[PDB]
Amino acid sequence: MAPWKIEEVKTLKGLIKSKPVVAIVDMMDVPAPQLQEIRDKIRDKVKLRMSRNTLIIRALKEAAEELNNPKLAELANYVERGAAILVTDMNPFKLYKLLEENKSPAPVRGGQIAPCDIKVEKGSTGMPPGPFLGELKSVGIPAAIEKGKIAIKEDKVVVKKGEVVSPKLAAVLDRLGIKPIKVGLNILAVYEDGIIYTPDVLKVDEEKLLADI
């Protein structure tokens, strides 16, 4: 590795060694607005560093050796997608709740596979008469003019889980301000005290024994 990589790994290791709780999170797929929403909520509670996955793996492995704390190196096995290093003083369970419980709503993207059933709600859109009425009907959303505005006729699933969201449907849903996807920093694994916590363990256990130290 060139010196710049060594120096960047040095900064990553410094971060890893600075706090008792070290997590690997995934920051893939987060639009600007939602990202600032996440920023506002975790701002003072954690520290985050983005870097290439190959550098993150090396930093974890070397930091583990340098601290005589081998278990730390296991985090490397959980690095994937938009991996980032997060460090904090808050316990792994409080961290999981912080990141996983308070996610930011986001619009679904055209051509994306729906992660869940996506629905619309009956009622006025507050928008004037125009071509949008036709757009709605064209994507399977019954609608009509009522009280001088465009209104959706009834609640309805417009696309099912596992089905692709057509670009026109995505455009129409976004125009309605519908944000059916939840986005944010996803925890891949967390280390604390020679213990590696997986998401399944964090979600099921829910809280740390004896709370805090």
Task: Give the whole-angstrom CA distance, residue 32 versus residue 37.
Answer: 9
Domain with 93, as residue range(s), is 1-103+184-213
**Resolution given for this structure, in angstroms:** 1.6
Task: Give the whole-angstrom CA distance, residue 108 versus residue 172.
Answer: 11
Regarding whether 127 and 72 lie in a shared domain, the answer is no
Regarding whether 189 and 179 lie in a shared domain, the answer is no
- Give pairs for 13-19: CB < 8 Å, separation 24+: 13/59, 13/62, 13/63, 13/66, 15/47, 15/49, 15/85, 15/87, 16/59, 16/60, 16/63, 16/72, 16/85, 16/87, 17/63, 17/66, 17/67, 18/47, 18/87, 19/47, 19/87, 19/88, 19/89
Regarding whether 79 and 28 lie in a shared domain, the answer is yes
Regarding whether 74 and 3 lie in a shared domain, the answer is yes
DSSP for 161-213, please give it.
TTSBPPHHHHHHHHHTT---EEES-EEEEEEETTEEEPHHHHHHH-S-TTS--
* Residue 115, phi then psi, degrees to nearest 5: -75, -15
Question: What CATH number is attached to the domain comprising 149?
Answer: 3.90.105.20
Task: Give the whole-angstrom CA distance, residue 122 versus residue 113.
Answer: 24
Residue for token pair 């005589």 = 68
CB 142 within 8 A of CB 123: no
Regarding whether 37 and 14 lie in a shared domain, the answer is yes
CB 117 within 8 A of CB 159: yes
Buried b (16+ CB within 10 A) or exposed e, 138-177: ebebebeeeeeebbbeeeeebbeeeeebbeebbebbeebe
Question: What CATH number is attached to the domain comprising 195?
Answer: 3.30.70.1730
Domain count, the chain: 2
Q: Which residue, among 53, 54, 45, has the nearest Cα to 86 in the 3D structure? A: 45
Regarding whether 76 and 6 lie in a shared domain, the answer is yes
Regarding whether 156 and 53 lie in a shared domain, the answer is no
Regarding whether 115 and 95 lie in a shared domain, the answer is no
Regarding whether 143 and 202 lie in a shared domain, the answer is no
* Residue 192, phi then psi, degrees to nearest 5: -165, 120
Query: 25 CB contacts (<8 Å, ≥6 apart)?
Result: 48, 83, 84, 86, 99, 185, 186, 187, 188
- Size of the chain, expressed as the number of residues it contains: 213
Regarding whether 165 and 148 lie in a shared domain, the answer is yes
* Residue 5, phi then psi, degrees to nearest 5: -70, -40
* Residue 181, phi then psi, degrees to nearest 5: -95, 145
Regarding whether 173 and 156 lie in a shared domain, the answer is yes
Task: Give the whole-angstrom CA distance, residue 189 versus residue 59.
Answer: 16
Q: What is the DSSP letter of 101?
A: I
Element (H, E) at 156: strand 156-159
Regarding whether 108 and 70 lie in a shared domain, the answer is no
Q: What is the 3-state secondary structure (H, E, C) of 25-40?
A: EECCCCCHHHHHHHHH
Residue for token pair 């944010």 = 184
Cα 211 from chain centroid?
A: 26
